[PDB]
Each structure stands twice: as structure tokens, then as C-alpha cells.
DNA sequence: GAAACCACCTGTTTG
DNA sequence: CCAAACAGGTGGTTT
């Protein structure tokens, strides 16, 4: 469960979303590379597959593959908010949803 | 001297610019720095007149078909305040280590 | 070919 | 103050 106000770069041709490292280390641990594949679900019940990775050059956690399709379907914009949630029960499943400028 | 100067270039304004890269003339590039022979790219260690050793990455950018120095060039430019129209002279010592050497000269515009 | 993807790089900003 | 983090970039490769 963490939320980010998305930057212009987040929703542009850079095809990447930067996760703040506090939240990345707290809620999404990485094996310690090419990275892992992560499955989330939106309110429509569609399940999105993203690639979660670490860039050691910039020391930053980023979603790359699959983020742009999310941006385009949801018509994300700079200033909107993206909220990551997890299952209440043992299903262990992650959910993604988006609100707009509080 | 103990040093042999290899080549020099009067820096374009983009060499000191936000592009953070020094275009190296292909004529002068294939001559002393052959990239297939590794002189992806390679890291080169060049020492200045102040004694500071500077590490740059030397590669060939197919997009511009340019031989270029790219990583650390901005630091050199910022510390030396390299400006468009100044000159960069690359040199090599005739020693067993054959160390490479760099420093800049003055001239306007 | 175009768009996305990939692994690097850096200048500002800031606790 | 300054190392860290990150918003904004690059060239090259795969889809």
C-alpha cells in the first residue's frame, strides 16, 4: 500500500515509472539484475503485468515494460495519483488503481 | 620531451554543452584510438597538467556516426570551465606505461 | 520502419 | 554541507 503523485516524465515517452525508494524497499523487496515481473489488478478487474527493476546507475526502482499501455488506457496525466494496494486475505494479490489530483 | 602529442581539437559549442560529449574527429580517432582494438566502449585514463587523472568512456555513436567521449566529460568541462573555441591537446608518454595525457589551451570564441 | 524496451547517465534538489 | 534520490535524459536493441 503506497501512493505516488505521478511526474510528467512518468506519463511520457520515457516509458517508465519511478517508485520512491522508501516505498520500493518497504513494500516490494527485490532479490539481492534484469528484474522481476509483477501482476496487479485494476477496478475493472483487468490484470496488468509490469517489469519491476533496479537501475544501479541512478540507484532507482522503476517499472518499465507495460507501464505505457497503462498510461494510455487510463489516460494518466501529470498530477494524478497512483495507489498500490494488496489483498486483505491470504490471496497475496496486488491491485493498482488511479485517482486524479486528490 | 617524455611526451608525444597525438592530436588536438578546437571544441565545438556542443562539446562544452548540455550534450555532455566531445566529438572526436574520425581522422584523429582511427589514428591513435582504435575502438575495434579497444584502444560498447572503453574507459580511458588521461592525466592533466595539474596532475589530476581523468577517466572518460570512449565509444562510437552510430546515430551520429561520431567517435565520442561521454562519461566524465561534463566534469572536465565544468572544472576547467572549458569554453567553445578553446583547444584540447591529447598526448602520450614514451614510457613502459605509455600514459595518455590531456590538457587545454586558450583562445577566444 | 516505428514504437517500445533496455541499460546506462546527470544536474537539481534537499533532509 | 553534501550524499542520496529522482526527474529528466541518451544510444542501442528488440518487438
UniProtKB/Swiss-Prot annotation, chain A:
Q: What gene name is given for the protein in this entry?
A: TEM1
Q: Which UniProt keywords apply?
A: DNA-binding, Ethylene signaling pathway, Nucleus, Repressor, Transcription, Transcription regulation
Q: GO biological process: what's one of them? A: cellular response to hypoxia
Stretches of the chain forming a coiled coil according to its record: none
Q: What's the stated role of this polypeptide?
A: Transcriptional repressor of flowering time on long day plants. Acts directly on FT expression by binding 5'-CAACA-3' and 5'-CACCTG-3 sequences. Functionally redundant with TEM2.
Q: Does the keyword Repressor apply?
A: yes
What is the taxonomic lineage of the source species?
A: Eukaryota, Viridiplantae, Streptophyta, Embryophyta, Tracheophyta
One GO cellular component term, please give it: nucleus
The entry's localization annotation reads: Nucleus
Give a brief account of the tissues where this protein occurs. Expressed in leaves.
GO molecular function per UniProt:
DNA-binding transcription factor activity; transcription cis-regulatory region binding
Please give the DNA-binding region boundaries. 2-102
* Highest taxon listed in the record's lineage: Eukaryota
Indicate what this protein is called per its UniProt record: AP2/ERF and B3 domain-containing transcription repressor TEM1
